[PDB]
Each structure stands twice: as structure tokens, then as C-alpha cells.
């Protein structure tokens, strides 16, 4: 579902995201970038594969995935994420507290697009630098 | 201009908005509805005209305006609005504390569209239900 167009996320901006993971779901997708053609951060936790997949979309080109094990969070309840945005790296605070790092391959310096996909009902959203 | 598409706001749910009013701006617009041609709530504080004009949009037809004279919030600071959605009316809480009631001309069940226009930089977005 949710789509957020035309937000102003500059380098150093800290994004706060909170919602409920649907019960009995494969996974969900949080996307940060310029649009659906240019995705700087492809955040895709997968309970089925017990991994968190991070990638980038540039037009019709997907970059190479990076997979993170921890997969601590489970479906059925409220979960908070925190995406810190630097023009070289993305930092992602997890529910437990551990952090994830993914390189900004698109070399951009401004994030405008947020879209939640899969089994995740976003309830709140906060943008602070 | 800011847009939030593909959300699911049902009657009884509360929408709270925190942002920053731009310094030296005429006013700003909050659009609640189901599209760009479907505005159930047109929330438009006008600092110049010193009135908050409320209206509905039905495709190519604006409804009839409802003007309020309780602008008690000023440009250049963090400000908060709360829009509770009911099947008959919208109840908008103002930062000072005043509640404004505006009828739901369009009816319907489903609120899917939010967009902020003018000199207003929404920093936070939260849904409760």
C-alpha cells in the first residue's frame, strides 16, 4: 500500500517508521528513493528465507542484493525502523537495536519517495535531521 | 507538493499531523479524500485573509466554503493538527486546542488520499486505529 511522494529527505536525515507486520506473511518492503524507477534503498525483510534483503533499483536494473541474517522481528505486532541517510551509506536501526548498513549506489543526495509493499500496515511516520 | 497515496483511513480513526509552517507564507493546504478530484476535506488556513476556509471537491465542482476565524498559530515554528474522520463530519483539532467541525459532503467509506500544499513542511504523520 502506502506511497509517499515529494518528501524532503536530505543527507543526515533520520527517518522514523512504525507499523504492524501482518500475520502469516512472507515479508514486506520499505522503499526509499526518487520514484518507483529509482530506488536508493530496497528494504525487504523475508521471514520465509529468514533474511533481510537490501538492494537498489535503477530503471529496469536491479543491483546486487545484500542479505542480513538477524531477522529478529516477527509478524503480528508493532515494529519501528529508523533509516539514517548519508550520501554514501544507509543506516537502519532495527527493533532489537542492531543496525544495518547499505551503500547508496545511486549516488543521489535527496530522497523524495517512500513506498511500503507486502504485509506491512504503516501507522506512523516521522522525518527529523 | 507532498502526497500520501494508498492509505486506508476508516471512520473512527484519528489522523495527527506535525510539521513546520514556512516563514512568510500566505497559507497552506491540507487535502483529505480519495484522490485529486476527490477531496472530502479541503483544509486551508489563510494567514493573509486571517481565515481557515474549509470545502469539498467533487471532481470539477467545489462545494460551498466554510470560514473559521480562529487562526492561533504562526509561521516559523512546529505546529500540530489532528483530523478525526467520522461518517458524517470531520473534527479538526487546532494547535491551541479549538475543535472545528466540517461535514462530510461526499460520504463514502474510504479515505485514501492525503496531500500537503503551500508553505507547510509536514515532519510527522500518524494514524491511530
CATH of residue B94's domain is 2.60.120.200
Cα distance between residue B26 and residue B75, in whole Å? 10
Polymer length of chain A: 129
Q: How many Cβ atoms are within 10 Å of B54's Cβ, its own excluded?
A: 23
**In chain B, residues 17-76 whose CB comes closer than 8 Å to chain A:** 18
Total of domains in chain A: 1
C-alpha cell belonging to residue A12: 543526515
Q: For residue B6, give the nearest of A2, A7, A125 by CB distance.
A: A2
Q: What is the dihedral angle through the alpha carbons of B43, B129, B78, A81, rounded to the nearest 10 degrees?
A: -130
Q: Are A8 and B8 in contact (CB under 8 A)?
A: no
DSSP sequence for A25-74: -SBEEEEEESSSSEEEEEEEEETTTTEEEEEEEETTEE---EEE------
DSSP state of B95: T
Cα distances from A59 to residues A65, A90, B50, in angstroms, run 16, 20, 46
Percent helix, strand and coil across chain B, each to the nearest 5? 0, 60, 40
Q: Is B8 in the A-facing interface, judged by CB distances under 8 Å?
A: yes
Q: Are B92 and B43 in contact (CB under 8 A)?
A: yes
Cα dihedral across residues B19, B96, B119, B101: positive or negative: positive
C-alpha cell belonging to residue A92: 537502519
B103: β partners: B89
Q: Residue A14 sits in which domain range? A: 1-129
Which residues in chain B have Cβ-Cβ distances shorter than 8 Å to A126? 18, 123-125
Specify whether the backbone of B83 is left (phi greater than 0), alpha (psi in -120 to 50) or beta.
Answer: beta
Amino acid at each position: 500500500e502506502l506511497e509517499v511522494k515529494n518528501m524532503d529527505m536530505k543527507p543526515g536525515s533520520t527517518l522514523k517508521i512504525t507499523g504492524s507486520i501482518a500475520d502469516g506473511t512472507d515479508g514486506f518492503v520499505i522503499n526509499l528513493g526518487q520514484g518507483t524507477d529509482k530506488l536508493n534503498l530496497h528494504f525487504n525483510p523475508r521471514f520465509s528465507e529468514s533474511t533481510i534483503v537490501c538492494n537498489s533499483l535503477d530503471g529496469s536494473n536491479w543491483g546486487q542484493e545484500q542479505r542480513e541474517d538477524h531477522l529478529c522481528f516477527s509478524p503480528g505486532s508493532e515494529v519501528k525502523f529508523t533509516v539514517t541517510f548519508e550520501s554514501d551509506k544507509f543506516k537502519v536501526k532495527l527493533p532489537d537495536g542492531h543496525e544495518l548498513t547499505f551503500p547508496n549506489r545511486l549516488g543521489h543526495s535527496h530522497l523524495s519517495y517512500l513506498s511500503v509493499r507486502g504485509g506491512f500496515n504503516m501507522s506512523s511516520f516521522k522525518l527529523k535531521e
